[PDB]
Design a protein around this ligand. Structure first.
Ligand code: HEM
Ligand code: HEM
Ligand code: CLW
Ligand code: CLW
Ligand code: ZN
Lengths: 400, 401
C-alpha cells in the first residue's frame, strides 16, 4: 500500500502516503518503467478538489464559505461551461504547481513565490509590458526573486495567449553554412522563426533573441527586449587568467515560458515563471553538452591537459573548472547563484518538511541528481517516488 | 503500443518492441514510478520459455530435438517437481542472465563469459576449492576474465547452498569504541558474523574477510583465502606524491556472490560471478561515499583546497583526483580497469547491437549513468526502459535471516 522510501547513506526510512492520491497517471506500468523519458463532469471533479485543497490550506475545510465556493463554481460551469478563480486561489494554485514539480531541486523556496495576476491582459502589447515588468522585478539588480505572471486562461470560443519562446531570455543559434551552428544549437528553430517574422538577425554567439508573443486568434508579434533589462554575466576563472579571454557569458534570469499551468481543471497556456540558477545548469549542461555550446574540449586544450585518452579524465577536469568559473563569476558580479552541493542539501530539507506536511514528495531522481558529482550530493543516496499531483506545470506542444 | 526511446544528444529514435515480452512485473504503476528503489504450473511455463530461447538461439526451433527436450522437462517436473539442465543450457542460461541485467553498464562482454559447472559440489570444503579456482582463473595475474560458478540448484528435500559474503573479496569493518569504524563500514555485519563463528580478526583498514560458506542444512564454515590468490593494487597519484603515503589500496577482482541465478524456473542461490572494475566504483563509491571509507575530505585538505565553502567545489576536485589515482594505479599495476567514459561508450554500442538482435534492451538509467560526470557520458542523454527478463540475476534475503 505505502511505498517504503529509504536513505542508504543514513539508513533513515519513511513511507510515501501522498502518492496514493496522484490525480493523473504516469507512463510507467508493472511491465516496464519509462521514468527516464523526457515526455464538464471531469472539469467539475478537478475544480472541486482544488477548492477543497484551498479551504484546507486556510484551515476552513467544511465551513459555509467552503460550501458556497463549491456551489458557485458548479453554477458557473453549468452556465458557461467553465469558471474563474479568485485572486487568492490563483496565488495558492501557482505555489502548489511549483511545490508539486517533481523535477525541481529548488522547491524549498516554493512558499515565497510572488504571483502576478495578469488575467486582464488585452493583447500582445500589454503582454510584452507584463513580461518586462516581470523581468525587472525578478532580476532585481542581481538579487533575484522568484516570481510568475499568469496570463488569461484557455477558454472555449477563442484562441489562447502563448509565448513562442522556450524562455524569456535565450541566445540565438545560426545554422552556419558547412553544417555547424553559431550560438545556441538548441535555439535554432525559434531563431529561424524570429527571422521569418521580420527580425534582423545577428552574427554573434550570445545574441539575445526577441520575444514572439501571440494573442488569441492573432498572428505572433515580434518584440525586442531592452538591453538594460536583460542582465548578463561575463565568464572568468579565479586562477585561469586566459578563461576571461574566451568571451563566454550567460544571462542572470532563468525563466521558462512555454509550460502550461493547470489549476482545478483550468489551463493557462501562458504563465512564465522564474527563479535563479544552479551553477551546473549553466557550466555543465548549457556550456558542456555535446549538442549545445560544447566548449569542453576547447577549455581542456587551454588547460594543457592530456586529451589523447579518456583515462586522464580531462573532460571531468575541464568541466569542474568551467563550473568553478560560473560560480566565481556570478558571485563577483553580485548575481544570485547556488552550487549543486548547497542546492541538493536544501532539497533534502524540503523532503523532511514535506514528509511532515503531506506525507511525501513527488520527485524525479534523474533530474534531482546534478549532472556532475552525483554521488557527492546527499540526494543521490535518497530513494524517491515520482507521481503527478495537481495543480501542476505541464509541457505543451509548440504553437507552430 | 511500443515505448518510443529517444537520444537527445544525436536525435535518433527507436521503439522497444522487446519490453512487451517482459516475463515479470516491476514496482512501477501508472500511479507512481519507483525505479529509484534499490529493492508447478508456473515452473513448467518458465522452463518451456527458456528451452524455446535455447533452441531458437541455435537455429533449431521447432525441430525434433527441441520438441523432445520440452517433453523431457515436463516428465521430470511431473515426477520430481524439478528438472536437470543440460550442460550447454546452463552455459547459455548464465550468459543471458548477464545479458538481461538492467543495472550493468558492462554488458557489451555478455557473450565472453567462462562458466564453471559446480552442480556436483557436496560440501563447504569443496565449495571453497571451486571458489579459489574461480578467483585464480578470473584474476589471471592481472588480465581479468569474466567468469561464473554455478553451485547445486535449489530443490525439495534439503536446504540451499549459500555464500554469506556479498562478494568473494571484501575488507573487514571493525567497530571502534567511539562510534567510528576502522575499515569498510559496509562490512560491519559480515565482519561481526565471521568473528562470532570463530574467526579471530586483524586490526587493519584493508583486511580480506574470510569466506563464510554454507552447505545444505549445515552451519556455515570459515575459509581463509590464500593471500597469493587475492590480487591487490597499491594506490598512488601521478603528480600528488603524498597520495601513495596514504597507504590506500583495493582488490582487483569484483565478484558478487550474494545473488540468485534464475534459469528456466530453476533457482541457483549460490552462483558467484565476476568481471572487472570500472574506476568510479572504487574511486567514487567505495572511497568517497560518506558511509564508506569517506576519504574525500582528507584528500581535499592534503590538496590544500579550501574546504570552508562549498562553492569552491573542493569535493568535486578531490573526487576527480582520487579517480585518476585509481586509474593510474591499476594501469601501472597491469590490472584490468576501465574508466566511465570508455565504459559508457561501449554500452551505447551494446544498445545498438541489442536493438538489431532483440529489438530493445532493458536498462536502469539511474545505475548506468556513472556516479560522477554523468552528463559528460553518452548514456546520460539516452532514454532507457527498465523491465525484468529471464534468465536473470536476482537479489535474495541473507541466509542468517
Ligand atoms: C529558486 C530557484 C530555482 C532553482 C535553483 C531551480 C532549479 C531547477 C532545476 C535544476 C531544474 C531542472 C532543469 C534541467 O536540468 O533541465 C528545474 C526544473 C523545474 N523547475 Fe525549478 N528552480 C528554481 C525555481 C523554480 C520556480 C520559481 C518554479 C516555478 C514557479 C520552478 C519550476 C520548475 C519546473 C516546472 C521545472 C521543470 C522544467 C523542465 O523540466 O523543463 N522552478 N528547476
Ligand atoms: C566485465 C566487467 C564488468 C563491469 C565493468 C561491470 C560493471 C558493473 C557496474 C558498474 C555495476 C553497478 C554496481 C553498482 O553501482 O553498485 C554492475 C552491476 C551488475 N553486473 Fe556488471 N560488470 C561487469 C561484469 C559482469 C558480469 C561478468 C556479470 C554477470 C555474469 C555482471 C552482472 C551484473 C549484475 C547482475 C549487476 C547488478 C548487481 C547489483 O544489482 O548489485 N556484471 N556491473
Ligand atoms: O538551475 C536552474 N534554475 C532554474 C529556475 C527555473 Cl524557473 C527553471 C530551470 C532552472 O534551472
Ligand atoms: O565497477 C564494477 N565492475 C563490476 C563487475 C561486477 Cl561482476 C559487479 C559490479 C561491478 O562494478
Ligand atoms: Zn517507473
Amino acid at each position: 500500500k505505502f511505498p517504503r522510501v529509504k536513505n542508504w547513506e543514513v539508513g533513515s526510512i519513511t513511507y510515501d502516503t501522498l502518492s496514493a492520491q496522484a490525480q493523473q497517471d504516469g507512463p510507467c506500468t508493472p511491465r516496464r518503467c519509462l521514468g527516464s523519458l523526457v515526455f464538464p463532469e471531469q472539469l467539475l471533479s478537478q475544480a472541486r478538489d482544488f477548492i477543497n485543497q484551498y479551504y484546507s490550506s486556510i484551515k476552513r475545510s467544511g465551513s459555509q464559505a467552503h460550501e458556497q465556493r463549491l456551489q458557485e463554481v458548479e453554477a458557473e460551469v453549468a452556465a458557461t461551461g467553465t469558471y474563474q478563480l479568485r485572486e487568492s486561489e490563483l496565488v495558492f494554485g501557482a505555489k502548489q504547481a511549483w511545490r508539486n514539480a517533481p523535477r525541481c531541486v529548488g522547491r524549498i523556496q516554493w512558499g515565497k513565490l510572488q504571483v502576478f495576476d495578469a488575467r486582464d491582459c488585452r493583447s500582445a502589447q500589454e503582454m510584452f509590458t507584463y513580461i518586462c515588468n516581470h523581468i525587472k522585478y525578478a532580476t532585481n539588480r542581481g538579487n533575484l526573486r522568484s516570481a510568475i505572471t499568469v496570463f488569461p486562461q484557455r477558454c472555449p470560443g477563442r484562441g489562447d495567449f502563448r509565448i513562442w519562446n522556450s524562455q524569456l531570455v535565450r541566445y540565438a543559434g545560426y545554422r552556419q553554412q558547412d553544417g555547424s551552428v553559431r550560438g545556441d544549437p538548441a535555439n535554432v528553430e525559434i531563431t529561424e522563426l524570429c527571422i521569418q517574422h521580420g527580425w534582423t538577425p545577428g552574427n554573434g554567439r550570445f545574441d539575445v533573441l526577441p520575444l514572439l508573443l501571440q494573442a488569441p486568434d492573432e498572428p505572433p508579434e515580434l518584440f525586442l527586449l531592452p538591453p538594460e533589462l536583460v542582465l548578463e554575466v561575463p565568464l572568468e576563472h579565479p586562477t585561469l587568467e586566459w578563461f576571461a579571454a574566451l568571451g563566454l557569458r550567460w544571462y542572470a534570469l532563468p525563466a521558462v515560458s512555454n509550460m502550461l499551468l493547470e489549476i482545478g481543471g483550468l489551463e493557462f497556456p501562458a504563465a512564465p515563471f522564474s527563479g535563479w540558477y544552479m551553477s551546473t545548469e549553466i557550466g555543465t549542461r548549457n556550456l558542456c553538452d555535446p549538442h549545445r555550446y560544447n566548449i569542453l574540449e576547447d577549455v581542456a586544450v587551454c588547460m594543457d591537459l592530456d586529451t589523447r585518452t579518456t583515462s586522464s579524465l580531462w573532460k571531468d577536469k575541464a568541466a569542474v573548472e568551467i563550473n568553478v568559473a560560473v560560480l566565481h563569476s556570478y558571485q563577483l558580479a553580485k548575481v544570485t547563484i547556488v552550487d549543486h552541493h548547497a542546492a541538493t542539501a536544501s532539497f533534502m530539507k524540503h523532503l523532511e518538511n514535506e514528509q511532515k506536511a503531506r506525507g511525501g514528495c513527488p520527485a524525479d531522481w534523474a533530474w534531482i541528481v546534478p549532472p556532475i558529482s552525483g554521488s557527492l550530493t546527499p540526494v543521490f543516496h535518497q530513494e524517491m517516488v515520482n507521481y503527478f499531483l495537481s495543480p501542476a506545470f505541464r509541457y505543451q506542444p509548440d504553437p507552430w
